[PDB]
């Protein structure tokens, strides 16, 4: 019951080094939004960077 469909990278379109488009095909129902929002907030509001 704890088994889950872990995603596997299928095709990462590498736009010029200032841009990228990463995608995952399998994942789980409702988990796509969870992971997307988690990553978006986690790297958009708190990241070690210099400016």
């Amino acid at each position: 019951v704890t088994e889950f469909l872990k995603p596997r990278l299928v095709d990462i379109e590498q736009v010029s080094s200032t841009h990228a488009k990463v995608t995952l095909e399998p994942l789980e129902r409702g988990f796509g939004h969870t992971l997307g929002n988690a990553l978006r907030r986690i790297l958009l509001s708190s990241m070690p960077g210099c400016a």
């Binding site: 129902r29 409702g30 939004h33 969870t34």
Partner: protein, 50 residues
């Protein structure tokens, strides 16, 4: 000109589905578009999803 007639009664339990016509008492009618998972529902401060 008939020998015997057999009537078979089938009970279908039709659950709510995308496309089922749902409508209130005030003339607001609409087809259910998507059965959105509860985790995606807008929830108030109490956490109860609409």
């Amino acid at each position: 000109g008939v020998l015997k007639i057999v009537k078979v009664y089938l009970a279908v339990k039709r659950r709510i589905q995308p496309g089922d016509k749902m409508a209130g008492r005030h003339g607001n009618k609409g087809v259910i578009s998507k059965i959105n998972p509860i985790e995606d529902m807008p929830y108030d401060e109490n956490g109860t999803p609409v």
